[PDB]
Structure formats: structure tokens, C-alpha cells
Enzyme design. Structure first.
Site, PDB file in Angstrom:
ATOM      1  N   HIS A  15      83.968  55.294 114.851  1.00 50.75           N
ATOM      2  CA  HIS A  15      83.888  54.996 116.273  1.00 50.75           C
ATOM      3  C   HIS A  15      82.454  54.679 116.692  1.00 50.75           C
ATOM      4  CE1 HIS A  15      88.030  56.597 117.468  1.00 50.75           C
ATOM      5  NE2 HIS A  15      87.948  56.740 116.153  1.00 50.75           N
ATOM      6  N   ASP A 112      86.206  57.781 124.456  1.00 48.48           N
ATOM      7  CA  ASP A 112      87.316  58.140 123.575  1.00 48.48           C
ATOM      8  C   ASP A 112      87.820  59.512 124.002  1.00 48.48           C
ATOM      9  OD1 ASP A 112      85.929  56.780 120.498  1.00 48.48           O
ATOM     10  OD2 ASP A 112      87.717  56.116 121.612  1.00 48.48           O
TER      11      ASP A 112
HETATM   12  O1  LIG Z   1      94.065  57.297 114.298  1.00 52.30           O
HETATM   13  C1  LIG Z   1      94.330  57.402 115.528  1.00 52.30           C
HETATM   14  C2  LIG Z   1      93.305  57.431 116.477  1.00 52.30           C
HETATM   15  O2  LIG Z   1      91.997  57.523 116.035  1.00 52.30           O
HETATM   16  C3  LIG Z   1      91.784  58.579 115.097  1.00 52.30           C
HETATM   17  O3  LIG Z   1      92.430  59.771 115.506  1.00 52.30           O
HETATM   18  C4  LIG Z   1      92.412  60.757 114.467  1.00 52.30           C
HETATM   19  C5  LIG Z   1      90.993  61.138 114.085  1.00 52.30           C
HETATM   20  O4  LIG Z   1      90.397  61.899 115.145  1.00 52.30           O
HETATM   21  C6  LIG Z   1      90.171  59.887 113.778  1.00 52.30           C
HETATM   22  O5  LIG Z   1      88.799  60.223 113.592  1.00 52.30           O
HETATM   23  C7  LIG Z   1      90.307  58.837 114.876  1.00 52.30           C
HETATM   24  O6  LIG Z   1      89.683  57.633 114.436  1.00 52.30           O
HETATM   25  C8  LIG Z   1      93.613  57.534 117.826  1.00 52.30           C
HETATM   26  C9  LIG Z   1      92.674  57.535 118.954  1.00 52.30           C
HETATM   27  C10 LIG Z   1      91.405  56.961 118.855  1.00 52.30           C
HETATM   28  C11 LIG Z   1      90.557  56.914 119.957  1.00 52.30           C
HETATM   29  C12 LIG Z   1      90.982  57.414 121.175  1.00 52.30           C
HETATM   30  O7  LIG Z   1      90.180  57.382 122.276  1.00 52.30           O
HETATM   31  C13 LIG Z   1      92.257  57.969 121.299  1.00 52.30           C
HETATM   32  O8  LIG Z   1      92.661  58.471 122.510  1.00 52.30           O
HETATM   33  C14 LIG Z   1      93.105  57.991 120.209  1.00 52.30           C
HETATM   34  O9  LIG Z   1      94.919  57.521 118.236  1.00 52.30           O
HETATM   35  C15 LIG Z   1      95.956  57.489 117.350  1.00 52.30           C
HETATM   36  C16 LIG Z   1      97.224  57.520 117.898  1.00 52.30           C
HETATM   37  C17 LIG Z   1      98.299  57.490 117.020  1.00 52.30           C
HETATM   38  O10 LIG Z   1      99.548  57.544 117.539  1.00 52.30           O
HETATM   39  C18 LIG Z   1      98.113  57.405 115.630  1.00 52.30           C
HETATM   40  C19 LIG Z   1      96.834  57.365 115.118  1.00 52.30           C
HETATM   41  O11 LIG Z   1      96.649  57.296 113.781  1.00 52.30           O
HETATM   42  C20 LIG Z   1      95.711  57.418 115.982  1.00 52.30           C
END
Ligand SMILES: O=c1c(O[C@@H]2OC[C@H](O)[C@H](O)[C@H]2O)c(-c2ccc(O)c(O)c2)oc2cc(O)cc(O)c12
Ligand SMILES: O=c1ccn([C@@H]2O[C@H](COP(=O)(O)OP(=O)(O)O)[C@@H](O)[C@H]2O)c(=O)[nH]1
Length: 454
Positions: A15, A112
Site C-alpha cells: 500500500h 485505507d
Molecule cells: O486483500 C484485501 C484487501 O487488502 C489486504 O487486506 C488484507 C491485508 O491487510 C493486506 O495487507 C491488504 O493488502 C482489502 C482492503 C485493502 C484496503 C482497504 O482500504 C480496505 O478497506 C480493504 O480488502 C479485501 C477485501 C476482500 O473481500 C478480499 C481481500 O483479499 C481484500
């Protein structure tokens, strides 16, 4: 007129890096960027700040939550199972975030995960902008309102089909739908179930944005705008910017010994660790190809060194044709090296962009994460720019022969599936790098941000 934008990404290198790529593009257009980063991580981000007079870093102290490894700041510092504790710690920066917003007074903040932020910003007269660097196809599939209203009546078989109105079709395997049905309910920070957290962000923010372009991400942004009734913007594909640090001479010299297009580069990002058996299957499958390879991998679960976990006799056989390496490397610079003929990728959104804008054949090895899986389906079945390694329908595991097979297919000049995916990758690269593609995305992006603050 120039905007003042604050950046508050999740504490993850996948990110931080694209937010900073985009920060440089915005600063080149004259916008002032206040970039919030964990304190120790700032040192590792300075190499990407191409406009230090317009982009200023502001350090955050990542506070202690019981269970958080000491001094940890990003998902590269903790096991994946500890991510929810790191999100509680992000939730706990609220005091220092509110202090930063009242002193810096940006017009917009990109963020995020922190669904408590739009309440603060509305009080301060700041516009909140939830900015995703994952695929809008993923958010659309798992976090659109039709999914959320089923609450705990959402099952694995429900997640085998797309939500009502979804704009495209692809197939998940049983174990993938099981993953999504269970993990969506698990707490991710401060007692909030994972999908509830993102739904709250979508529901409460002033506007939404995604990395991407109309030609690829368009239908999903249109669906999300229809569902949530607020602007859903596209930043453009966030093409990687050039670092101030040249390629490490150690890798440059070693890579330079191989014939052009002959080396297989394999990397599964900065967060995850394989289990031992799949670590073995992956490395034995690379060996079976007979191609030189560079595998950037953490030691598997249970192990602390690569050397201890390698299959018996592996180093002795592979000799100088292959390296398995656990440290952080300059992936973007390696993917531009002419030796690289194949990228075996976990289908992280950042790694996907880095492969698409280069010449390497794409082999898709998505790990168990909704965005990786959906990226792999779109790349393998919609864009058809890569070949996906077969997994067991119910067990989610691959064989070394399936790894071997996928790499052999794309590396074989006479294989027609390999020629087709090369030809499609070329079409996609030419689109993403088109002289006016990213710039016209950013033109629209910046006009809509100006509308947002008016
Ligand atoms: O992989 C996912 C993801 O990012 C990942 O979420 C999981 C871990 O925290 C990772 O570091 C991150 O990149 C995020 C996400 C990222 C940024 C945001 O502002 C937010 O609200 C959600 O949503 C998801 C929703 C899903 O249905 C399935 C996923 O697979 C992810
Ligand atoms: O050793 C490494 C591992 C990763 N990356 C970079 O880290 C980001 C990883 O983001 P992605 O979404 O591909 O995967 P993640 O690591 O978040 O799973 C990309 O910019 C990669 O080029 C890197 O430079 N070196």
C-alpha cells in the site's frame, strides 16, 4: 489551483509503495502531499520521494497492542495471522492523526481501512477519500451491499456466484469460496469483522477511488458507483516511478550472466510464508524446467533459514543456475532486466502491474487471498495474459508438475498457448504505456478531486 492532499495508507509495503508512486504523479502536477508513514519505515521510503519540496513525510508511532511484536510497523514485520493486531494499532493512531489534520489542514485525505476517519474529517471540513490499490473487482465481489445484507447467512455456495448485478463472470474453486466465506467474518482490528470494516469505509467516506483505468477496471467502478451512489474514481494504473537507487550490483552482475529472456523470476510478495510442502513443490517445479531462476521467498512455516528448508540435494543439483533468497530486493528493477523471461507471481496487485508493463511471460500462482485469486482469474481468463498453475479443487494445493507445466508452456516459443498469452500481454502493455493513457486518467482524476472539494 493546487490541492493539499494527505496520504494515510495501510501499514503494508504493497500500500505504501503505490500511494507514493501516485504521490509523485500528483506532486508533478503541482499538488502538495502530506504523507503519513510509520516512523522507522520512512527511511525505506525516501528513495521513492522524487519531489521532496512538495511531498513531506510525517511519522506515526505505531502503538502497542497486546500480541504485537515489538517495534513492528508493517505487515512485512509480522506474520499474516498477526495482521488484525496491527490493524488495532492503526485504529489507535487516531489521536496523532487528528493532531496532524488540525495542524496541516489538507483539503482531502486518502486512506485505507480506518472507517472512523470520515467522522473526524467532516468535523474538520476535510473530504475523505477511500483509496484502494487492490482490484475493484474484488471489492465488488465480496463487499457490495447484496453481500452485506446476507450478514451471517452468507455461505461458501453463495460466494461461488457473483453478487446481483456484478458485471463479469468467472469461476472460483470450492476451497476459494470456503476461504472467502470464513475469513470475511474474522475480526480485523478492534473487534470489527473484516468485511464489515471495509463496508463501513465504503458507506461513510465522501468518495471512493481505485488504482486502474477505464479499459480494465471500468465495469467494476461503474457497478460500485451504482451500488454506493457516490463518486468512484480511477487514478490511472499507477505506473511505477523510477527510484533514486540503482539496481544492486550483486544482482545486476549475476543476472547479467544469463541469456536474454532465459531466467524465471519467482516472488510471492513481502507478507506471506509458504507451508513446507508447497515450498518444496514450487522449488522442485522450477528445477524441473531446466531454466535459471531467482526465487524470492520467505522460509516456510516452521523454518528460519532457506537453507534448512530446501529439498534434499537441491543446492548441489541447482549449482549456479538458481538462487533462493529471503531478503527484500528491488523487484521492479529486476523485472526490467533483459534476462527475465518469466514471472511466477502471487498476483498481488502491485506485482501484477510491474509484470504487465514489462516483457516477462506471466505465470499465475495466487495465494489464498481474495484479491490475489480474483486478479489471477481476470489475468488468466479475461485478459488472458498469463497461465495459472492448477490447484486441487478442495485442498488448494499444487504439484511440482503443475508448476513445471505452466512455466514450460509460456517459455516455449513454439507453444501456441504461450504465444497467445505473449500476444495478449503485449496488447495490455501497449495500452497501459500508451502515451496519453495514464495522463488522461490523471486529468480526469484531478478534475473530479477538484469537484469533490468545491
Ligand atoms: O486483500 C484485501 C484487501 O487488502 C489486504 O487486506 C488484507 C491485508 O491487510 C493486506 O495487507 C491488504 O493488502 C482489502 C482492503 C485493502 C484496503 C482497504 O482500504 C480496505 O478497506 C480493504 O480488502 C479485501 C477485501 C476482500 O473481500 C478480499 C481481500 O483479499 C481484500
Ligand atoms: O522483495 C520484495 C517484495 C516486494 N517488493 C515490492 O513490494 C510490492 C508488493 O506489492 P504486491 O501487492 O505485489 O504484494 P504484497 O507484498 O503486498 O503481497 C511491489 O511494489 C513489489 O515490487 C519489492 O520491491 N521487493
Amino acid at each position: 489551483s493546487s490541492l493539499h492532499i494527505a496520504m494515510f495508507p495501510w501499514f503494508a509495503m504493497g500500500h505504501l509503495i503505490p500511494y507514493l508512486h501516485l504521490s509523485n504523479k500528483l506532486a508533478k502536477r503541482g499538488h502538495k502531499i502530506s504523507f503519513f508513514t510509520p516512523k522507522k519505515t520512512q527511511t525505506k521510503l525516501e528513495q521513492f520521494n522524487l519531489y521532496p519540496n512538495l511531498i513531506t513525510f510525517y511519522p506515526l508511532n505505531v502503538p502497542h497492542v497486546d500480541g504485537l511484536p515489538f517495534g513492528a510497523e508493517t505487515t512485512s514485520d509480522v506474520a499474516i495471522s498477526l495482521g488484525p493486531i496491527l490493524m488495532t494499532a492503526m485504529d489507535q493512531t487516531q489521536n496523532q492523526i487528528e493532531l496532524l489534520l488540525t495542524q496541516l489542514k489538507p483539503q482531502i485525505i486518502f486512506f485505507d481501512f480506518v472507517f472512523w476517519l470520515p467522522k473526524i474529517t467532516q468535523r474538520l471540513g476535510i473530504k475523505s477519500f477511500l483509496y484502494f490499490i487492490i482490484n475493484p473487482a474484488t471489492i465488488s465481489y465480496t463487499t457490495s451491499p447484496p453481500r452485506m445484507f446476507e450478514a451471517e447467512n452468507l455461505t461458501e455456495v453463495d460466494l461461488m456466484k457473483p453478487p446481483k448485478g456484478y458485471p463479469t463472470s468467472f469461476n472460483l474453486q470450492s476451497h476459494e469460496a470456503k476461504h472467502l466465506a470464513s475469513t470475511r467474518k474474522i475480526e480485523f482490528g478492534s473487534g470489527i469483522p473484516f468485511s464489515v470494516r471495509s463496508y463501513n469505509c465504503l458507506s461513510l467516506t465522501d468518495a471512493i477511488g481505485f488504482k486502474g483505468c477505464r479499459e480494465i477496471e471500468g465495469p467494476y467502478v461503474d457497478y460500485l458507483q451504482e451500488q454506493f451512489g457516490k463518486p468512484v474514481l480511477l487514478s490511472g494504473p499507477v505506473l511505477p516511478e523510477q527510484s533514486k537507487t540503482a539496481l544492486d550490483e550483486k544482482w545486476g552482475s549475476w543476472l547479467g550472466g544469463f541469456k536474454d529472456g532465459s531466467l524465471v523470476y519467482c516472488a510471492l510478495g513481502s507478507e506471506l510464508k509458504l507451508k513446507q510442502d508447497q515450498f518444496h513443490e514450487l522449488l522442485l517445479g522450477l528445477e524441473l524446467t531446466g531454466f535459471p531462476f531467482l526465487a524470492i521467498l520467505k522460509p516456510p512455516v516452521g523454518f528460519e533459514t532457506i537453507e534448512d528448508a530446501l529439498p534434499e540435494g537441491f543446492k548441489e543439483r541447482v549449482k549456479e543456475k538458481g538462487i533462493v533468497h529471503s531478503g527484500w530486493i528491488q523487484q521492479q528493477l529486476i523485472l526490467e532486466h533483459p534476462s527475465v523471461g518469466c514471472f511466477v507471481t502471487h498476483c498481488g496487485a502491485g506485482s501484477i502491474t510491474e509484470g504487465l508493463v514489462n516483457n516477462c511471460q506471466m505465470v499465475l500462482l495466487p495465494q489464498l487471498n481474495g484479491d490475489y485469486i480474483i486478479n489471477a482469474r481476470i489475468m488468466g481468463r479475461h485478459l488472458k495474459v498469463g497461465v495459472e498453475v492448477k490447484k486441487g479443487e478442495e485442498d488448494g494445493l499444487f504439484t511440482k508438475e503443475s508448476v513445471y507445466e505452466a512455466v514450460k508452456i509460456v517459455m516455449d516459443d513454439e507453444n501456441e498457448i504461450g504465444r497467445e498469452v505473449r500476444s495478449n500481454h503485449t496488447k495490455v502493455r501497449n495500452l497501459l504505456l500508451r502515451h496519453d493513457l495514464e495522463s488522461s486518467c490523471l486529468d480526469t482524476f484531478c478534475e473530479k478531486l477538484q469537484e469533490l472539494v468545491s
